[PDB]
Design a protein around this motif. Sequence first.
Motif, PDB file in Angstrom:
ATOM      1  N   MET A 117      63.242  27.628  99.111  1.00  0.00           N
ATOM      2  CA  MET A 117      62.731  26.353  98.569  1.00  0.00           C
ATOM      3  C   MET A 117      62.218  26.559  97.154  1.00  0.00           C
ATOM      4  SD  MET A 117      60.511  27.979 100.656  1.00  0.00           S
ATOM      5  CE  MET A 117      58.808  28.589 100.513  1.00  0.00           C
ATOM      6  N   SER A 118      62.668  25.716  96.223  1.00  0.00           N
ATOM      7  CA  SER A 118      62.231  25.710  94.822  1.00  0.00           C
ATOM      8  C   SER A 118      62.423  24.304  94.240  1.00  0.00           C
ATOM      9  CB  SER A 118      62.960  26.795  94.014  1.00  0.00           C
ATOM     10  OG  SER A 118      62.671  26.626  92.644  1.00  0.00           O
ATOM     11  N   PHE A 119      63.628  23.989  93.744  1.00  0.00           N
ATOM     12  CA  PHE A 119      64.014  22.751  93.047  1.00  0.00           C
ATOM     13  C   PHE A 119      63.240  22.502  91.734  1.00  0.00           C
ATOM     14  CE2 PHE A 119      67.029  19.213  93.960  1.00  0.00           C
ATOM     15  CZ  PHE A 119      66.698  18.343  92.907  1.00  0.00           C
ATOM     16  N   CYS A 120      63.958  22.123  90.670  1.00  0.00           N
ATOM     17  CA  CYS A 120      63.398  21.882  89.337  1.00  0.00           C
ATOM     18  C   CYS A 120      63.799  20.494  88.811  1.00  0.00           C
ATOM     19  CB  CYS A 120      63.852  23.007  88.398  1.00  0.00           C
ATOM     20  SG  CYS A 120      62.952  22.891  86.823  1.00  0.00           S
ATOM     21  N   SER A 121      62.848  19.786  88.200  1.00  0.00           N
ATOM     22  CA  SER A 121      63.029  18.480  87.566  1.00  0.00           C
ATOM     23  C   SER A 121      61.806  18.170  86.700  1.00  0.00           C
ATOM     24  CB  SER A 121      63.161  17.385  88.629  1.00  0.00           C
ATOM     25  OG  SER A 121      63.295  16.130  88.002  1.00  0.00           O
ATOM     26  N   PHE A 122      62.017  17.665  85.488  1.00  0.00           N
ATOM     27  CA  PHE A 122      60.994  17.018  84.674  1.00  0.00           C
ATOM     28  C   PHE A 122      61.617  15.906  83.820  1.00  0.00           C
ATOM     29  CE2 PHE A 122      62.191  21.212  82.928  1.00  0.00           C
ATOM     30  CZ  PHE A 122      62.654  20.908  81.637  1.00  0.00           C
ATOM     31  N   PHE A 123      61.025  14.714  83.883  1.00  0.00           N
ATOM     32  CA  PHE A 123      61.455  13.512  83.166  1.00  0.00           C
ATOM     33  C   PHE A 123      60.254  12.561  83.020  1.00  0.00           C
ATOM     34  CE2 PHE A 123      64.478   9.589  83.243  1.00  0.00           C
ATOM     35  CZ  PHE A 123      64.915   9.794  81.922  1.00  0.00           C
ATOM     36  N   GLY A 124      60.311  11.579  82.118  1.00  0.00           N
ATOM     37  CA  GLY A 124      59.286  10.530  81.996  1.00  0.00           C
ATOM     38  C   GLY A 124      59.689   9.222  82.684  1.00  0.00           C
ATOM     39  N   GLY A 125      60.987   8.908  82.678  1.00  0.00           N
ATOM     40  CA  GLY A 125      61.593   7.711  83.277  1.00  0.00           C
ATOM     41  C   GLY A 125      62.535   6.989  82.307  1.00  0.00           C
ATOM     42  N   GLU A 126      62.212   7.018  81.015  1.00  0.00           N
ATOM     43  CA  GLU A 126      63.075   6.522  79.944  1.00  0.00           C
ATOM     44  C   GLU A 126      62.827   7.265  78.626  1.00  0.00           C
ATOM     45  OE1 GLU A 126      65.960   5.471  79.588  1.00  0.00           O
ATOM     46  OE2 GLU A 126      65.778   3.428  80.354  1.00  0.00           O
ATOM     47  N   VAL A 127      63.834   7.293  77.753  1.00  0.00           N
ATOM     48  CA  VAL A 127      63.797   8.010  76.462  1.00  0.00           C
ATOM     49  C   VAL A 127      63.086   7.235  75.330  1.00  0.00           C
ATOM     50  CG1 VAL A 127      66.153   7.288  75.760  1.00  0.00           C
ATOM     51  CG2 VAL A 127      65.295   9.500  74.970  1.00  0.00           C
ATOM     52  N   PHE A 128      62.684   5.980  75.574  1.00  0.00           N
ATOM     53  CA  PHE A 128      62.443   4.996  74.506  1.00  0.00           C
ATOM     54  C   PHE A 128      61.355   5.368  73.480  1.00  0.00           C
ATOM     55  CE2 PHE A 128      58.844   3.515  77.103  1.00  0.00           C
ATOM     56  CZ  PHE A 128      57.938   3.057  76.131  1.00  0.00           C
ATOM     57  N   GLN A 129      60.352   6.169  73.861  1.00  0.00           N
ATOM     58  CA  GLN A 129      59.138   6.383  73.068  1.00  0.00           C
ATOM     59  C   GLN A 129      59.369   7.013  71.684  1.00  0.00           C
ATOM     60  OE1 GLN A 129      56.806   7.303  77.133  1.00  0.00           O
ATOM     61  NE2 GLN A 129      55.725   7.941  75.351  1.00  0.00           N
ATOM     62  N   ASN A 130      60.519   7.646  71.437  1.00  0.00           N
ATOM     63  CA  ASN A 130      60.879   8.263  70.170  1.00  0.00           C
ATOM     64  C   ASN A 130      61.733   7.346  69.256  1.00  0.00           C
ATOM     65  OD1 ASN A 130      60.690  11.725  69.769  1.00  0.00           O
ATOM     66  ND2 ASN A 130      59.525  10.731  71.336  1.00  0.00           N
ATOM     67  N   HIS A 131      62.002   6.090  69.637  1.00  0.00           N
ATOM     68  CA  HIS A 131      62.812   5.151  68.852  1.00  0.00           C
ATOM     69  C   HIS A 131      61.992   4.383  67.801  1.00  0.00           C
ATOM     70  CE1 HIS A 131      65.854   6.568  71.573  1.00  0.00           C
ATOM     71  NE2 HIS A 131      65.823   5.574  72.475  1.00  0.00           N
ATOM     72  N   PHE A 132      61.393   5.129  66.870  1.00  0.00           N
ATOM     73  CA  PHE A 132      60.649   4.599  65.714  1.00  0.00           C
ATOM     74  C   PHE A 132      60.985   5.289  64.375  1.00  0.00           C
ATOM     75  CE2 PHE A 132      57.817   7.859  67.614  1.00  0.00           C
ATOM     76  CZ  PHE A 132      57.465   8.612  66.481  1.00  0.00           C
ATOM     77  N   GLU A 133      61.921   6.241  64.364  1.00  0.00           N
ATOM     78  CA  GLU A 133      62.267   7.028  63.173  1.00  0.00           C
ATOM     79  C   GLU A 133      63.045   6.198  62.122  1.00  0.00           C
ATOM     80  OE1 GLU A 133      63.741  10.642  65.514  1.00  0.00           O
ATOM     81  OE2 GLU A 133      62.423  11.608  64.058  1.00  0.00           O
ATOM     82  N   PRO A 134      62.894   6.500  60.816  1.00  0.00           N
ATOM     83  CA  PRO A 134      63.362   5.632  59.736  1.00  0.00           C
ATOM     84  C   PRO A 134      64.886   5.624  59.553  1.00  0.00           C
ATOM     85  CG  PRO A 134      62.435   7.602  58.761  1.00  0.00           C
ATOM     86  CD  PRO A 134      62.141   7.615  60.259  1.00  0.00           C
TER      87      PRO A 134
END
Length: 124
Positions: free
Chosen positions: A1-18
């Motif tokens: 038993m191990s299993f690996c996963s990490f996510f926030g739920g959506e990518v959107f938070q970085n969509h402010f770059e010029p």
Amino acid sequence: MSFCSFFGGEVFQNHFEPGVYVCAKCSYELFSSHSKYAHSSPWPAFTETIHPDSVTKCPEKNRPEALKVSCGKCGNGLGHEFLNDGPKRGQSRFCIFSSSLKFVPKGKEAAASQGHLEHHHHHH
Ligand SMILES: [Zn+2]
């Protein structure tokens, strides 16, 4: 038993770059630097527009508190302004489709800042 996963739920938070906006048909780069502001959220929009000659709009019939705007040069018509409904607030702001025009970002970041060097003068 191990299993690996990490996510926030959506990518959107970085969509402010010029960057810049360009036509979905014409590819010519056009947006005013004053017509949008910087934020990271759902519901992206712009408060004003460039108001050129080459794009045009028309009011709704069935929606008489809002209007549709088109790229009347190449003959599009997918963006909107919810006009006369909001005039005191940040109500009445333009919203557009991704198929109406494209995004071209900057290199990494930079932008949104001042720098000036220009001259031509002659007398003879
Ligand atoms: Zn166009």
